[PDB]
């Protein structure tokens, strides 16, 4: 009844009034590539009003490219936000902020790779965070956001399978750079850009250049 | 993201861009009660534009009541059509007509302790000559999701009451079905007469011209209006 016209992402959609975690369900269950798991709320990941979903992916691309899947989610969210005239910017490598307030988070877990996305739409949010409703000053049709995001993600994914390096330029043009950050042992410096592997390039005050790979660290803006 | 507020039917929904058969998938897959399987189109037992779905049910009601599930679907469709200003009438036991043109069909199948309620409703899809659709009746494109939401809401309500008061559905069928007209039951031992009413088992009561009264069981029956 949804009439989705995507190639892979959204071939099937499993909707839940409530679920513990869309990522856990997607990881555990036997699902086909492109299947989207979406729930009104998550009890053990996410209140009603937000967009909580996970996508099952099985990209046949060199192992060296797999680490960029998180970027597909971040860029997809930024593109959807722009469609709704909201200025979302990427906090390397998995979050999207609006005026430095978190509006969305991406979590990839993995053969079968699960791309999880949580976006604040009409739900109440934690202090310091924001939502589409708070930014636009009015409720936003959740289904419209879902349709927009799925369409963007499908296009981004299909191109990623053919041109795995393309996503990097989209990330660069939509990410927060040129400001000081703290990488948590722990160091500070200017976030200059991301390299050809998606690593965050940081210039320390000493002049030293460090390359950050995600997985074992956290980024804090100063 | 659909924000369904139903109790059982619609707790989970599995949507397919394309599927062979929603009934087949629902029958062969382990799914919690209330799961709705819906597809834009079915390729093998339903073009784009229609509402094609199946609902998984495992009602803990007496064996004698299990056969009435088909009526839940038929009445649910009639109620949804009414909300859209369309007057549908039930052609016993599983079809819904509008001005005698078929607009929906219900098919109930099963596997183990699970019953699958299948419903096919013509909304914006092209239909065979003689049949109709919500689009043809209203003269405009009808938002498919709104029809889905309406139908799921009605079915959930009918189902929750059926679990408690299983005889109630028969009254709703009776008040929404085509009666007082001549019909012919096809097949072996074929016969014709007036469709008088439905009894406490959901059987069609037919009065033959001779005065003989026959009771027709549903599920696998072929009936024609004369």
């Amino acid at each position: 009844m949804l009439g989705l016209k995507t190639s892979i992402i959204g071939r099937r959609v499993i909707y839940f009034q409530e679920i513990t975690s869309t990522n856990e369900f997607a990881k555990t269950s036997y699902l086909e590539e492109g299947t989207v798991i979406v729930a009104d709320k998550q009890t053990m990941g996410s209140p009603e009003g937000g967009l909580w979903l996970s996508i099952v992916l099985s990209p046949k691309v060199p192992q060296k490219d797999l680490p960029k899947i998180v970027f597909l989610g971040a860029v997809g969210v930024v593109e959807t936000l722009k469609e709704f005239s909201i200025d979302g910017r990427i906090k390397w490598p998995n979050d999207v902020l609006v005026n430095y307030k978190k509006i969305a988070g991406v979590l990839v877990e993995g053969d079968k790779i699960v791309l999880g996305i949580g976006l604040n739409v009409n739900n109440k949010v934690p202090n310091g965070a924001t939502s589409m409703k708070l930014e636009l000053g009015s409720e936003v049709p959740l289904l419209s956001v879902f349709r927009s995001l799925i369409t963007n993600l499908d296009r981004l994914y299909l191109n990623f399978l053919k041109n795995p390096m393309d996503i990097l330029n989209l990330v660069r043009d939509n990410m927060i750079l040129g400001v000081r950050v703290k990488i948590l042992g722990s160091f500070e410096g200017i976030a200059e850009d991301i390299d050809d592997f998606g690593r965050l390039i940081i210039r320390l005050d000493s002049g030293e250049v460090k390359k950050v790979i995600y997985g074992d660290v956290s980024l804090r803006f100063l």
Side-chain angles (χ1 to χ4, degrees), chain A:
Chain A
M1 85 283 212
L2 293 184
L4 302 188
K5 298 298 174 195
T6 48
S7 292
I8 296 175
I9 296 178
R11 281 192 65 188
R12 297 187 180 185
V13 178
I14 301 179
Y15 155 84
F16 295 74
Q17 285 190 28
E18 184 185 60
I19 198 176
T20 54
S21 159
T22 60
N23 257 31
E24 292 311 319
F25 183 89
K27 290 162 55 186
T28 303
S29 306
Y30 288 117
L31 305 167
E32 297 306 74
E33 185 182 27
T35 292
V36 179
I37 305 302
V38 63
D40 291 324
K41 65 177 172 192
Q42 302 185 104
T43 57
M44 285 279 85
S46 310
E48 293 200 307
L51 186 59
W52 321 113
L53 61 79
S54 298
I55 305 167
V56 175
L57 306 171
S58 189
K60 288 289 88 68
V61 184
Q63 316 171 61
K64 55 90 166 183
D65 296 301
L66 297 163
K68 288 173 288 187
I69 295 177
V70 60
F71 294 147
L72 296 177
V75 170
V77 172
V78 169
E79 297 186 335
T80 284
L81 290 175
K82 287 172 65 65
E83 284 174 37
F84 286 79
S85 296
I86 293 174
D87 194 0
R89 307 189 71 197
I90 300 171
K91 165 175 170 281
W92 185 88
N94 51 5
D95 292 338
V96 181
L97 317 181
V98 178
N99 302 312
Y100 279 94
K101 302 194 71 179
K102 186 174 179 178
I103 196 170
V106 181
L107 176 61
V108 177
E109 292 180 272
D111 207 53
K112 178 164 69 174
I113 300 299
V114 174
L115 169 59
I117 299 172
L119 168 64
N120 298 320
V121 183
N122 303 311
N123 54 297
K124 295 165 161 63
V125 301
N127 301 351
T130 192
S131 70
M132 293 180 77
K133 176 176 177 182
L134 287 169
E135 297 297 333
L136 300 173
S138 183
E139 178 170 296
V140 182
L142 195 54
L143 178 63
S144 298
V145 181
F146 173 85
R147 292 182 184 282
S148 168
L149 182 57
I150 289 306
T151 291
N152 287 324
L153 291 173
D154 189 63
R155 178 181 64 260
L156 289 164
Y157 184 61
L158 271 289
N159 189 55
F160 173 78
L161 297 178
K162 170 181 174 177
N163 307 298
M165 304 302 284
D166 288 10
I167 186 63
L168 295 181
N169 282 309
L170 298 181
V171 173
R172 293 194 181 92
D173 305 323
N174 290 291
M175 75 186 311
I176 301 169
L177 295 170
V179 302
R180 196 185 185 76
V181 298
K182 179 183 291 179
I183 304 299
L184 321 78
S186 165
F187 70 88
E188 293 174 43
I190 296 295
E192 302 288 357
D193 179 44
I194 51 166
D195 66 12
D196 61 314
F197 279 110
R199 292 183 292 189
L200 189 64
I201 306 301
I202 295 177
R203 179 184 187 288
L204 289 68
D205 291 349
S206 68
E208 177 187 4
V209 176
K210 290 185 71 62
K211 307 184 184 180
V212 192
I213 58 182
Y214 188 74
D216 66 309
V217 299
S218 179
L219 181 157
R220 282 276 214 279
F221 281 116
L222 303 172

